[PDB]
Design a protein around this ligand. Structure first.
Ligand SMILES: Nc1nc2c(ncn2[C@@H]2O[C@H](COP(=O)(O)CP(=O)(O)OP(=O)(O)O)[C@@H](O)[C@H]2O)c(=O)[nH]1
Ligand SMILES: Nc1nc2c(ncn2[C@@H]2O[C@H](COP(=O)(O)CP(=O)(O)OP(=O)(O)O)[C@@H](O)[C@H]2O)c(=O)[nH]1
Lengths: 414, 405
């Protein structure tokens, strides 16, 4: 038995990204995602118990999906079949609709007890849980509000379990809800306060990464969630595969190697190679645009990077020399010399015979949030769309405190 | 995830006619309800082939409901009331409105009592009539006070600027828009001459109200497209209220549908948010957008939708409190109306719709000071003081739009 990880997904982006995530993870283990049962005659490759459970039996994922509208959960059910436990699937009707306060004080409050009934049911089935991954978009209302409520009640009742968040940020190219600044700042406060770590995505960055660097004239959001899924598969392969040359990395150990200070726990990620199914690949991983966020991280400053290779290793001394050579021309912080965690996995991804995933802590992400904060400067100088936040239960002073906490995070980075 | 549609007045009933004429085969059914993607939000389960659109066609001086029943509705919920609508708001409110409100709300609460879960109401009417104006206002009053947690949306046809079909229609319009303010959290306004010019551009011969109401029907269908056609980036009516209504009483929307078809997507998106493609003649040059919802459906590609930013950074003019790349409620639906591989809807909270309001104000500013038609209200139970305060509320709303620029 190995350290466990429960992935709770909230909101539309979180649930669809989770659907693709366990799709690719199951087909990495040789498990059919649309059914949830293992392939006959084929053993699960790696440590399945970290993210799955033998429910008698079936290799069911330990995923909790909640959404205040039924459409997304029903779509995930249609595209995934009997993979997830219907008990672990909780749905409401009216939705939150871009409103944080609905998921925070409102429908979120009444849907919370069943959600954590399923959650502590799942965690009681865990052997030694060392992390919880919250897959969501903090731009939306259900995602932000219930991610906030869920992580807050976790860290008040638990608190020895690390929390990795995976939040989809608004695209600077286009917004999808006009209350995304509100939801993002409101959930960013509790991500700072409650979640021990957070992973950040951005849609149009994945668009430009999958348009010319995947050979599709116009990729859909399916390919964006597929890129995020490849990122998550590479990141969690350290928690999913064991052996001699490979090193096992728990989410707590990954937390320790990625989080030097309690407030420095928002992470960037990148994937290599950027080709449809070595030194050029080494620079492909660390390109200015290869990160899954709308920024240029090479003028920022990497705090600590987890570089997880997975696949065949024929030139390990030459590749270690390549990492040593590239470290000279990368922005690294002086106060953590051991900023590189070189994780290895013998088994590669399905799409590529050899791949790498970058999971970095960089200061540039702050300026990313800053532009979101800049958007918060527009909806709050005029007091717009904030009537329903007040009506559902939040307050003027509460919103001011949450925005001040987001600014505290941004100034803690710099 | 359930809709009760309210249809008061001749204009609202013809809007409903076209609305279900396209909504039925949008889910693969004929007009009579025979089978030829959760479509149960509009329709109640009655028969395996007959998915009944539970929408009340309540209207004084029925007249047109006979040709509506000739396309099968639920005959029990609808009523062909004893005539006498005139164009008097009070005649649909308290003269003959008081002798129909008990029955119509018995129908409404019988329809919503058998609902697994409701999201709100989509009412189609014309504010310029007497039945769809006064009866609609009374229904709004006794529906907001009955279900304050539900979200009423009104698809109201504002009277035309160029020519009029009623001689008391600004009175009715203002004194119904006041009730729409005090009783609903969402409203899509329709202007007829904009519909005529859009149908002139779309077709090659002279249109009529049926084409205009087909356009209105496409508008209403695409309003709830992301709610009944669940794809990616779903949208809800609660979401419409949260992200299209920046201030408590500012919930009046202007809507454009495109195209007017295996068209290239940049053209579809740039002609969706076209100043001359919207279905309400509002003020664009001096006006600005408060909250634009782009609901694209069909053969839409996510990068295609998100890369069409030229029409937003070039043509769309926003208010100072909205971010330059923001102001977009994006929605994706897997299904588009037939004849369109990919289609788009722009639902904009806009300042210029106040211009719509003010033209009615202008008419009211010349009638009330001259005691023009107010005795028709006074002898019917509606005094001049309540008309004056209703116009005061409407003028305050238009000033709120002018201050939100
Ligand atoms: N990479 C992906 N991003 C997505 C996906 N779905 C949505 N998104 C992105 O999420 C962002 C909006 O967040 P959502 O509205 O989906 C989260 P939520 O359902 O909780 O919002 P409400 O329903 O309003 O409460 C937007 O940028 C979308 O482009 C997806 O399947 N993959
Ligand atoms: N743009 C559209 N306008 C319409 C349509 N039908 C009617 N109208 C116009 O709406 C305006 C007023 O609508 P109505 O008088 O039909 C509303 P109502 O039936 O309640 O009036 P009364 O029955 O006389 O009390 C008038 O210009 C009508 O010609 C339509 O399908 N589309």
């Amino acid at each position: 038995k190995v350290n466990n990880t429960i992935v709770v997904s909230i909101g539309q982006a979180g649930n669809q990204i989770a659907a693709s995530f366990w799709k690719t993870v199951c087909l990495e283990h040789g498990i059919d995602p649309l059914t949830g049962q293992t392939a006959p005659g084929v053993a699960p490759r790696g440590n399945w118990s970290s993210f799955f459970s033998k429910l008698g039996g079936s290799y069911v994922p330990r995923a909790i999906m909640v959404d205040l509208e039924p459409s997304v959960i029903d779509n995930v059910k249609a595209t995934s079949g009997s993979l997830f436990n219907p008990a672990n699937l909780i749905s409401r009707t009216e939705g939150a609709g871009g409103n944080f306060a609905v998921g925070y004080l409102g429908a979120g409050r009444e849907v919370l007890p069943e959600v954590m009934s399923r959650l502590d049911y799942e965690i009681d089935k865990c052997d030694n849980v060392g992390g919880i991954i919250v897959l969501h978009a903090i731009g939306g209302g259900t995602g932000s509000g219930f991610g906030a409520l869920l992580i807050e009640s976790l860290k008040e009742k638990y608190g020895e379990i690390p929390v990795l968040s995976c939040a989809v940020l608004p695209s600077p190219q286009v917004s999808s809800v006009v209350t995304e600044p509100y939801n993002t700042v409101f959930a960013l406060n509790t991500l700072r306060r409650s979640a021990d770590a957070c992973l950040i995505f951005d849609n149009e960055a994945l668009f430009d990464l999958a348009h010319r660097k995947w050979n599709i004239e116009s990729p859909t959001v399916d390919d964006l969630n597929l890129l995020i899924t490849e990122a998550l598969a590479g990141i969690t392969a350290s928690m999913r595969f064991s052996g001699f040359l490979t090193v096992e990395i728990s989410l707590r150990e990954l937390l320790t190697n990625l989080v030097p200070q309690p407030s420095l726990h928002f992470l960037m990620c990148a994937f290599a190679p950027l080709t449809p199914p070595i030194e050029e690949m080494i620079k492909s991983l660390f390109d200015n645009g290869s990160v899954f966020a709308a920024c240029s991280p090479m003028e920022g400053r990497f705090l600590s990077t987890a570089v997880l290779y997975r696949g065949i290793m024929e030139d390990k001394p030459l590749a270690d020399a390549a990492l040593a050579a590239m470290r000279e021309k990368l922005p690294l912080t002086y106060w953590i010399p051991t900023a590189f965690k070189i994780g290895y996995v013998e088994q590669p991804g399905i799409s590529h015979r050899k791949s790498m995933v970058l999971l970095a802590n960089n200061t540039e992400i702050a300026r990313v949030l800053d532009r979101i904060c800049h958007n918060f400067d527009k909806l709050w100088q005029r007091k717009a769309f904030a009537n329903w936040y007040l009506n559902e239960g939040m307050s003027e002073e509460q919103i001011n405190v949450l925005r001040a906490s987001a600014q505290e995070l941004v100034q803690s980075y710099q | 995830r359930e809709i009760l549609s309210i249809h008061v007045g001749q204009c609202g009933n013809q809007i409903a006619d076209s609305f279900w004429r396209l909504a039925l085969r949008e889910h693969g059914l004929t007009e009579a309800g025979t089978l030829k993607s959760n479509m149960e939000v509009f329709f109640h389960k009655v028969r395996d082939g007959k998915y009944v659109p539970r929408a009340v066609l309540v209207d004084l001086e029925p007249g047109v409901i006979a040709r509506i029943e000739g396309q099968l509705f639920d005959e029990s919920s609808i009523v062909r009331k004893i005539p006498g609508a005139a164009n008097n708001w009070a005649r649909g409110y308290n003269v003959e409105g008081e002798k129909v409100i008990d029955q119509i709300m018995n129908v409404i609460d019988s329809a919503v009592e058998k609902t697994k879960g409701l999201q709100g109401f989509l009412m189609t009417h014309s504010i310029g009539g007497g039945s769809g104006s006064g009866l609609g206002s009374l229904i709004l009053e006794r529906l907001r006070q009955a279900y304050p947690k539900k979200r009423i949306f009104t698809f109201s046809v504002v009277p035309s600027p160029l020519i009029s079909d009623s001689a008391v229609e600004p009175y009715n319009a203002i004194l119904t828009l006041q009730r729409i303010l005090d009783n609903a959290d969402g409203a899509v306004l329709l202007d007829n001459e904009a519909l005529f010019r859009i149908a002139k551009a779309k077709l090659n011969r002279s249109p009529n109200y049926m084409d205009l109401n087909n356009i209105i029907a496409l508008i209403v269908s695409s309003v709830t497209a992301s709610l009944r056609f669940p794809g990616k980036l779903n949208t809800d009516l609660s979401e419409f209220v949260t992200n299209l209504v920046p201030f408590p009483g500012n919930h009046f929307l202007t809507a454009s549908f495109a195209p007017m078809v295996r068209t290239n997507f940049p053209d579809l998106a740039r002609e969706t948010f076209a100043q001359d493609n919207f279905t309400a003649a509002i003020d664009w040059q001096q006006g600005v957008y408060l909250a634009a919802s782009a609901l694209f459906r069909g053969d839409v590609k996510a990068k295609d939708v998100d890369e069409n930013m030229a029409t937003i950074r070039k043509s769309l003019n926003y208010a100072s409190y909205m971010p330059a790349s923001g102001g977009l409620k994006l929605g994706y639906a897997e299904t588009a109306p037939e004849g369109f591989a990919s289609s788009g809807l722009a639902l904009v909270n806009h300042t210029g719709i106040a211009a719509v309001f003010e033209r009615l104000i202008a008419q009211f500013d010349i009638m009330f000071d001259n005691h023009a038609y107010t005795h028709w209200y006074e002898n019917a139970g509606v005094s001049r003081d309540m008309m004056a305060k209703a116009r005061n509320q409407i003028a305050t709303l238009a000033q709120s739009y002018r201050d939100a620029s």
